Amino acid sequence: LQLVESGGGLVQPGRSLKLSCSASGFIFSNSYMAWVRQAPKKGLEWVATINPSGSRTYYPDSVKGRFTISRDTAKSSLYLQMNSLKSEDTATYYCARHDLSFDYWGQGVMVTVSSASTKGPSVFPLAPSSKSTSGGTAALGCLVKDYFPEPVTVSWNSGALTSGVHTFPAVLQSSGLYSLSSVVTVPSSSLGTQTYICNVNHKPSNTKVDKRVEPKSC
Amino acid sequence: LQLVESGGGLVQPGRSLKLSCSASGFIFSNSYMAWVRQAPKKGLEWVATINPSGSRTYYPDSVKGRFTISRDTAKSSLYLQMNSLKSEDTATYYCARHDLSFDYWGQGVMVTVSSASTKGPSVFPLAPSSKSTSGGTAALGCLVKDYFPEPVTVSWNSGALTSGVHTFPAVLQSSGLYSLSSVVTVPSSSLGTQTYICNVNHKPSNTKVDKRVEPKSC
Amino acid sequence: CGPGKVQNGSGNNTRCCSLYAPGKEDCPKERCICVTPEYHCGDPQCKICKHYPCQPGQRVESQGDIVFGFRCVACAMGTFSAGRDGHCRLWTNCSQFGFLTMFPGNKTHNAVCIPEPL
Amino acid sequence: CGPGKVQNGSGNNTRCCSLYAPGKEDCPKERCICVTPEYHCGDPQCKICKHYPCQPGQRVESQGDIVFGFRCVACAMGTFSAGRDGHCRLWTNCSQFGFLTMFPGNKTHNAVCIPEPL
Amino acid sequence: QFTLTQPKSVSGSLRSTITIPCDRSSGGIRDSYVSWYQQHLGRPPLNVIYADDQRPSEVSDRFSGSIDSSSNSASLTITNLQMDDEADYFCQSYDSDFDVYIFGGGTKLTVLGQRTVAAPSVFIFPPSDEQLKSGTASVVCLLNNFYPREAKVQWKVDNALQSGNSQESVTEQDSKDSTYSLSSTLTLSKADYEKHKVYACEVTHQGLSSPVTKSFNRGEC
Amino acid sequence: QFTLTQPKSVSGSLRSTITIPCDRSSGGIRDSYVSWYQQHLGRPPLNVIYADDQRPSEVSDRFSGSIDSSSNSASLTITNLQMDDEADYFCQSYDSDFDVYIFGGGTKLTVLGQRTVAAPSVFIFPPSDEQLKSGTASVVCLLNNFYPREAKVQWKVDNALQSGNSQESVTEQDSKDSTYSLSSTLTLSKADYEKHKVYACEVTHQGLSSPVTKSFNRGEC
């Protein structure tokens, strides 16, 4: 069985989208079919139900009157006509089949409802402690702050430095903008002599930055 | 509704053929479909049954284990895979549809399973009586004997003589060869002065004969 | 005919059909029985009702996959038929209805009932 | 299960699917009612039998179009149920069987019968 | 279990009831579809009745079927017989799952015309000298322009009736005079032919007051 | 209708038995039905049980469901816990026609691995002068290479505990040392940042004998 969702993307508040789920794989019109969503990092929320004939539809609440589900045997496709979208409708949307109990599921398509616009990040140093005792470990990094949409890529010294590197998952701030940090732990004895540059690319905004990070002075 | 049989012909004893019946015309896969045969001049003998799905095959007896029936919606065609053919399988084979009771039928395709192969006829005179009383009617003709396969054509005086002409149906002899007679009734007073020639063509053997027929003498 | 079943035909072609169980597969569709007595489906789809009477203690078997031939076979065990119609009706279990059974019944005849004497 | 109906499953998944199947093969046989007491179909197709007991004078309603939820509603008028199984069996009309009725019956209890004083 | 029987032929006047009986022949399953089919010339069969009655559309109401007697006895009735109803008629049945499908043997229905005085002109042809050289002798008897079709043609060779060594061919009915013509061919070996003297064709037909013999002696002129 | 409550999480050793209890909550008809769905990484949910038990094929017999208590209490039992059973577990419910389909809040199942393999290296980063020019100050605390995942990171600014103005990000588990790393970012306005002196990150973790504080004074070096 294979289910492939499509038609998700970035959309303004108050706009509309139509998701599609292509199937075959089983007995499409000979089974029920569901939509379910999930905000990244959060729980599953059930979203839709279409009768196998397609005669009747069933929905939950927060989207009743705004969304729509239907089927077309032509290419085993579902029809999530989502209207009047709000920030709370931002989520990964999955298709699957209620048949007996959600038999198979797709990989999901991300819907992002945002007043936020394509914005490039600023790149700030997370500077290693100047007062670090020689013979231990120091940490340094780059803070990549205030960007939209995802994703941003971070490498260190053009990919030549990979051991001790931790590039954290992006966090959505209450501003609607993403921020992420990349850090690396290095010998404190290397701080005077090894250059450390984080290479940041936010391709959605055309923003490319190389940031040298070193001990702050006075 | 139109049903067209094809794939019949002349075949050696112990050989195989495949008949086809093209249809559309109705609801092919949405109906049963039959094969029935008939020796020329004899009765109808039921021969094949195919499930509309094609899942099950039903056969009579003299051909069970030797014949085969199947369907392919592609072009609404039937599949009479006839194997190990014998002289008794020589017949016109018709397709039709058992639906409710043999709804529509084709024109039929002739299968000839014979030993004796192509052979041209000999043409013999059927001579008018020499002793015929002048003022009555005399009969004369041509006997076209010992040919295979059918057909032979007979005309008289290159088609200029047609009244009083009777060209009989061919008869299959116990030898496996056909024979036929053509006759014409003429004024007995014309026997001395009008020439009578039968023009015989057996195109399957390349045999073409003009035979002058007149009163036998002494 | 009946509220949750489908009337088709009139007079002697009177029959009732069940939903075609459109679920899936290709087994069959519109299984219909005919209402007029001693009349039975002639085709598997029951397009027309035909006449083939039986006797008591017999049902009507119907072999054929396009047009039926009819064999008047006897009633199965656990069933009866007291008419010429040739349908094996099930025995009336008096116990599950409220009563006891005075005569148990056989192929010819269904069971009569006896009660609770209090 | 029964002669003119289709047995499916074993143990607690036992099914008395009616709708026969026109004596075919892997047809879409349906209309099944679990025989196991207090067990009921879980899906509309009755693929699996689930457990949801009721009390006397109640039946088991089953709302849902793929997987059932269960409400233990009371017995309809004209019916009864004297067990936890939750099936509305019809009243035993003693009059059509041979007897009169001593106590008429209600939702909790079926009728009993007083015959013909011989 | 397979069986079915029909009368070889039935002849009736125009505008007259025609009854073609189909008998179960001990099958015992008197009631089931007993379809009736009609075959003309070398054309395919046409379904006249399926389901015992309920004639399909087009076929004339004059064709009706019935399954009475129940003592094994379907019947096809043609009321008010017409000239276009000349044909072989076939009944076909069931056993669709009892075992096999089967047609009856067919019944020939012939129409009526002026046949009382429609006698054949009768001719006999000896075998030719050119045929006798190839080792075979064919003796031909011709019956020309007769009605009805029913004729009896008998070959005698030195008084002995010949049987199993002759074959007949009959023309279809003429479109102008409504007659038939018939050729009968007696075939012998040359060696058999040269044993005997008198070769005779005897023709019995309704339009002949007594049988007509045409004959020759071998080796005369 | 609207109910179904699940515990937040549990940590269990390999080979142990973990029971995840999906409390019906105002279940009423608790026995109506239950299903268990399993979610790993950013992958789609996998159905582990539909119909209360009868695990679909593939899922390991070690997953079993039961609906006992009847006092509102379905449960998913994982016997003999394996390392590939780390995942959020969800209990889908019924109400298919009672009103609408519903899903529980999920339960996180963590595995006990090499416990206390390492204690977190704790670092604090002040906001940069370049960020302070744009009107905002971000203070970052890093916890490096620790196990288990459970840590408590608290921000103090001039003794005041900060709440609602910070955000955390945690790496997925390292594929070589099996540790986690965590960044916590405290965000203030520049004007708020310049009011206060002492900025501190306090880290409580199982591998630390007592909480570790990392701090700086604003405007020092």
What are the φ/ψ torsions at residue E170 (nearest 5 degrees)?
-125, 130
Distance from CA of E2 to the nearest CA of B (A): 10
User: How far, in Å, CA of F71 to CA of C22, rounded?
Assistant: 39
Q: How many CA atoms lie within 13 A of A44 on its CB side?
A: 36
> In whole angstroms, what is the distance from residue B202 CA to residue C37 CA?
65
- Put simply, whether D29 touches C (Cβ < 8 Å) is yes
DSSP string, E129-146: HHHHTTTEEEEEEEEEEE
Report the distance separating Cα F129 and Cα A217, nearest Å.
12
Torsion angle of alpha carbons A185, A187, A190, A192, nearest 10°? 80
Could you give the CA distance from residue A178 to residue A204 in angstroms, rounded to a whole number? 13
Check CB contact of A101 with chain D, cutoff 8 Å: yes
CA dihedral F110, F112, F117, F121 (to 10 degrees): 20
Strand partners, F167: F185
Give how far the C-alpha of residue D99 lies from the chain's centroid of Cα atoms, to the nearest Å. Answer: 25
Q: What is the DSSP string of D52-63?
A: ----TTB--EEE
Contacts of C3 by beta carbon, 8 Å cutoff, 6+ apart: none
The answer as to whether D72 is a domain residue is no
With respect to residue D80, please indicate whether it lies within any of the assigned structural domains: no
D96 in any annotated domain:
no
Give the CA radius of gyration of chain C. 17
Task: Compute the distance between CA of residue C89 and CA of residue C105 in angstroms, rounded to an integer.
Answer: 12
Cβ–Cβ < 8 Å for E99, E2: yes
Report yes or no: E185 and E138 within 8 Å, Cβ to Cβ. Answer: yes
C37 with C60, same domain: the answer is no
Experimental method: cryo-EM
Helix (H, G, I), strand (E, B) or coil at C95: helix
In chain A the domains, ranked by start, together with CATH numbers, are 4-113 (2.60.40.10), 122-212 (2.60.40.10)
| A174 three-state secondary structure | coil
| Extended strands (E) in chain B | 4-6, 10-11, 17-22, 33-38, 44-50, 57-58, 71-72, 77-78, 80-82, 91-96, 109-113, 122-126, 137-147, 153-156, 165-167, 171-172, 178-187, 197-202, 207-212
| Phi-psi map region of B146: left, alpha, beta (phi>0 left; psi -120 to 50 alpha) | left
Q: Count helices and strands (H / E) in chain C.
A: 1, 11
Closest CA to E33 of E105, E114, E97: E97
Interatomic CA distance for residues E27 and C69, integer angstroms: 11
| CA distance linking residue E27 with residue E99, whole number of Å | 12
With vertex at residue F186, the alpha carbon angle to CA F183 and CA F187, rounded to the nearest 5 degrees, is 130
3-state SS class at B30: helix
Q: Is residue D104 part of a domain?
A: no
Verify A-B touch: 3 or more CB pairs within 8 A. Answer: no
Question: Tokens representing C47?
Answer: 């397009």
DSSP β-bridge partners for residue A125:
A142
> Residues 186 to 215 of F: which have CB under 8 A from any D CB?
none
E strands along B71-136, which residues? 71-72, 77-78, 80-82, 91-96, 109-113, 122-126
Residue B62 tokens read as 């003299």
* Chain D residue whose CA is closest to F98: D63
Q: Domains for chain E: give ranges and CATH numbers.
A: 9-110 (2.60.40.10), 121-217 (2.60.40.10)
F101 and A127 in contact by Cβ < 8 A? Answer: no
Q: What share of chain E is helix, strand, coil (3-state, %, to 5)?
A: 5, 45, 50
Confirm if F163 and F153 have CB atoms less than 8 A apart: no
How far is Cα A166 from Cα A163, in angstroms, rounded to an integer?
Answer: 9
Residues of F in contact with D69 (CB under 8 A): 29, 32-33, 94-98
F101 to A43: CB separation less than 8 angstroms, yes or no:
no
**Which residues lie closer than 8 Å to E175 by C-beta, 6 or more apart?**
none
Distance of CA B127 to the CA centre of its chain: 28
Element (H, E) at C114: strand C112-114
C-alpha–C-alpha distance, residues B184 and B198, integer Å = 10
Q: How far is CA B37 from the centre of its chain?
A: 13
Per this entry, what is the length of chain E? 221
Segment 91-110 of chain A within 8 Å of chain F by CB: 94, 96, 98, 100-103, 105-108
Q: Which of D45, D31, D30, D37 is nearest to D12 (CA)?
A: D37
Closest residue in D to A98 (Cα–Cα):
D66
User: Quick one: which H or E segment has residue A58?
Assistant: strand A57-58
Alpha-carbon distance of C38 to C52, in angstroms, equals 6
CATH number, domain with residue C74: 2.10.50.10
Strands E35-39 and E87-92: antiparallel
Amino acid at B162: T
B47: closest CA among B92, B10, B86?
B92
Judge if C40 and C67 occupy the same domain: no
C59 and C88 within one domain: yes
Residues E187, E166 contacting (CB under 8 angstroms): yes
- Mark yes or no for CB contact F97/D65 under 8 Å: yes
- Of E137, E182, E134, E188, nearest to E165 by C-alpha is E188
B100 with E51: CB under 8 angstroms?
yes
- Structure-block tokens of residue B61: 């007896």
- Find where tokens 């479909």 sit: B33
- Please tell me the distance from the alpha carbon of residue F149 to that of residue F168, in angstroms, as a whole number: 13
Question: Residue C94: which H helix or E strand, with range?
Answer: helix C94-97
Within 8 A by CB and 6+ apart from A90, the residues are A39, A111, A112, A113, A114
Laid out side by side, the sheet with E151-157 consists of: E160-162, E151-157, E198-205, E212-217
Tell me, yes or no, whether D61 lies in a domain. Answer: no
Compute φ and ψ for A88, nearest 5 degrees.
-70, -15
Q: How many angstroms separate the CA atoms of B36 and B96, rounded?
A: 8
Q: Residue B131 and residue B110: Cα distance in Å, rounded? A: 46
Half-sphere exposure in the Cβ direction for F139 (13 Å, CA): 28
Contact B129, B138 (CB under 8 A): yes
Cα gap A98→F50, rounded to integer Å = 10
Residues paired with residue A18 on neighbouring β-strands, in sequence order: A81
Given a contact cutoff of 8 angstroms between Cβ atoms, the answer to whether F88 and F36 are in contact is no
SS3 A47: strand
Chain breaks in chain A (C to N over 2.5 A) after: none
Q: DSSP letters of E174-204? A: PTTT--EEEEEEEEEEHHHHHH--EEEEEEE
C86 touches chain E (CB under 8 A): no
- Asked if the Cβ–Cβ distance from C67 to B58 is below 8 Å, we say no
Answer yes or no: are the C-beta atoms of B45 and B108 closer than 8 Å: no
Sign of the dihedral through C-alpha B20, B25, B31, B36: negative
At residue B44, φ and ψ (nearest 5 deg) are -80, 130
Question: For residue C94, which of D2, D97, D106, D117 has the smallest C-alpha distance?
Answer: D97
Distance from CA of F66 to the nearest CA of D (A): 12
Resolution of the model in angstroms: 4.4
Residue A24's alpha-carbon distances to A70, A98, C114, E33, F58, in angstroms, are 16, 16, 61, 44, 22
Rounded CA separation F173/F149 (Å): 9
What is the number of other CB atoms lying within 10 angstroms of the CB of residue E135? 10
Give the 3-state secondary structure of residue C102. Answer: strand
- Same-domain status, C97 and C47: no
Sign of the four-CA dihedral B204, B208, B213, B217: negative
Please tell me the distance from the alpha carbon of residue B197 to that of residue B51, in angstroms, as a whole number: 57
Cα E140-E146-E149 angle, rounded to 5 deg: 90
The DSSP H or E segment spanning E123 is strand E121-125
Alpha-carbon B82 to chain mean position: 20
Say if residue C65 is in the same domain as residue C27.
no
- Which of D30, D47, D81, D109 has the most C C-beta neighbours within 10 Å, making it the best mutation to test the interface with C? D30
What is the rounded end-to-end Cα distance, in angstroms, of chain B? 64
Pair C73, C47 in one domain: no
Between CA F103 and CA A44 the distance in angstroms is 7
Top residue of A30, A55, A99, A100 to mutate, by most chain C CBs within 10 Å, is A30
For residue A14, what are the contacts with CB-CB under 8 A and spacing of at least 6?
A84, A85, A86
CA distance to partner chain C, nearest, from residue B114 (Å): 35
Do both C79 and C117 map to the same domain?
yes
For residues D74 and D87, give the distance between their C-alpha atoms in angstroms, rounded to a whole number.
Answer: 10
Longest CA–CA span in chain C (Å) reads: 58
Angle CA C39–C40–C45, to nearest 5: 140
Q: What share of chain C is helix, strand, coil (3-state, %, to 5)?
A: 5, 30, 70
Are residue C44 and residue C75 in the same domain, yes or no?
A: no
Supply the Cα-derived Rg of chain D in whole angstroms: 17
Of residues E77, B103, B101, the one with CA closest to residue C42? B101
B163 contact partners, CB below 8 Å, separation of at least 6: none
- Closest CA relative to residue D31, chosen from D1, D71, D53, D52: D1
Name the one residue in this structure whose structure tokens are 């986690």.
Answer: F180
DSSP 3-state of B111: strand
User: In chain D, how many domains are there?
Assistant: 1
CA C69 to chain centroid: 17
Residue E27 CA, distance from chain mean position: 27
- Chain C to chain D Cβ contacts (< 8 Å): 73
Q: Token pair 């269904």 is at which residue?
A: C110
Listing DSSP states for F116-135 in one string gives TS-PPEEEEEPPPHHHHTTT
E85 SS3 class: helix
> Quick check: helix, strand or coil at residue E70?
coil
Is residue A79 within 8 A of residue A18, CB to CB? The reply is yes
What is the torsion angle, in degrees rounded to the nearest 10, for the CA atoms of residue B155, residue B157, residue B161 and residue B165?
Answer: -40
Domain that includes residue C22, residue range:
1-51
